[PDB]
């Protein structure tokens, strides 16, 4: 048995900022501080204005990214689990949940902008990090790419859920993991956008 009246619920994912890609300069903006984030995770009620394609999101313990593509805000299952997302009307249930693809999605928040899936086939990609770095990545397979300049894995911590973009700024994938050797990220693993598209098709 167990005492049911004291069973807690997991909080909602909370949008706490965005990676601004609108101008000629990429930069992170914070829209909610830590105390606000904790409260909003509990209530699931977030009245803040949302803008942009890449959101900075937080659970109780971690901060990472979520990316809007085709009207859905996507992130990684290993980060978000089955959590609701906070919104002006209260918690919003996931529209997509797929542990096998490591993928979740919610209806894109009002005010957000969506990326469109890449159709050009380019293997020259750009990873947008949680600190608003735009890192060149050569595509190496369906779900892998190599960093042109390897980095300590710390550099990529917090970027799970962010986008890989083609040269024209279309979505190629969702970053999920670094391939590391002795703490150095030489490559990345991502969820291909075609996998999101199939998820949306049925
Ligand atoms: C992302 O969730 C994030 O930003 N998290 C911060 C806390 C909010 C995070 C980005 C890390 C740079 N992703 C991960 O932590 C992923 C997820 C995916 C499911 C489990 C975890 C582990 N992970 C990783 O990126 C790891 N990488 C790996 O496990 C790779 N393996 C190795 O690097 C390796 C394996 N054997 C020997 C030597 N090295 C595998 C490789 C195959 C594809 C999947 C990733 C770490 C070690 C955390 C970088
Ligand atoms: Zn493209």
Short mmCIF file of N, CA, C and O and ligand atoms in Angstrom, two decimals, residues 116-122 165-172, ligand 2:
data_model
loop_
_atom_site.label_atom_id
_atom_site.label_comp_id
_atom_site.label_asym_id
_atom_site.label_seq_id
_atom_site.Cartn_x
_atom_site.Cartn_y
_atom_site.Cartn_z
N UNK A 116 10.11 25.02 -40.94
CA UNK A 116 9.55 24.10 -41.92
C UNK A 116 10.59 23.00 -42.19
O UNK A 116 11.78 23.28 -42.15
N UNK A 117 10.14 21.76 -42.41
CA UNK A 117 11.10 20.70 -42.70
C UNK A 117 11.92 20.96 -43.96
O UNK A 117 11.42 21.45 -44.99
N UNK A 118 13.20 20.62 -43.87
CA UNK A 118 14.12 20.73 -44.99
C UNK A 118 13.73 19.74 -46.09
O UNK A 118 13.39 18.59 -45.82
N UNK A 119 13.80 20.20 -47.33
CA UNK A 119 13.57 19.35 -48.50
C UNK A 119 14.76 19.40 -49.46
O UNK A 119 14.68 18.82 -50.54
N UNK A 120 15.85 20.04 -49.08
CA UNK A 120 16.96 20.25 -50.02
C UNK A 120 18.02 19.16 -50.03
O UNK A 120 18.83 19.14 -50.95
N UNK A 121 18.04 18.29 -49.02
CA UNK A 121 19.02 17.20 -48.97
C UNK A 121 20.45 17.59 -48.63
O UNK A 121 21.36 16.76 -48.73
N UNK A 122 20.68 18.83 -48.23
CA UNK A 122 22.04 19.28 -47.91
C UNK A 122 22.61 18.50 -46.74
O UNK A 122 21.91 18.21 -45.77
N UNK A 165 19.77 22.69 -38.54
CA UNK A 165 19.21 23.42 -39.67
C UNK A 165 20.08 23.24 -40.89
O UNK A 165 21.30 23.06 -40.77
N UNK A 166 19.46 23.31 -42.07
CA UNK A 166 20.20 23.28 -43.34
C UNK A 166 20.66 24.71 -43.63
O UNK A 166 20.34 25.63 -42.89
N UNK A 167 21.41 24.90 -44.73
CA UNK A 167 21.88 26.25 -45.02
C UNK A 167 20.77 27.29 -45.24
O UNK A 167 21.02 28.49 -45.04
N UNK A 168 19.59 26.84 -45.66
CA UNK A 168 18.43 27.72 -45.88
C UNK A 168 17.58 27.90 -44.62
O UNK A 168 16.54 28.55 -44.67
N UNK A 169 18.01 27.37 -43.48
CA UNK A 169 17.29 27.59 -42.22
C UNK A 169 16.09 26.70 -42.02
O UNK A 169 15.23 26.99 -41.19
N UNK A 170 16.03 25.58 -42.74
CA UNK A 170 14.95 24.64 -42.55
C UNK A 170 15.35 23.54 -41.58
O UNK A 170 16.54 23.27 -41.42
N UNK A 171 14.37 22.92 -40.94
CA UNK A 171 14.67 21.93 -39.91
C UNK A 171 15.09 20.60 -40.53
O UNK A 171 14.36 20.01 -41.32
N UNK A 172 16.23 20.09 -40.08
CA UNK A 172 16.75 18.79 -40.52
C UNK A 172 16.60 17.75 -39.42
O UNK A 172 16.43 16.56 -39.69
ZN1 LIG B 2 17.10 22.48 -46.62
#
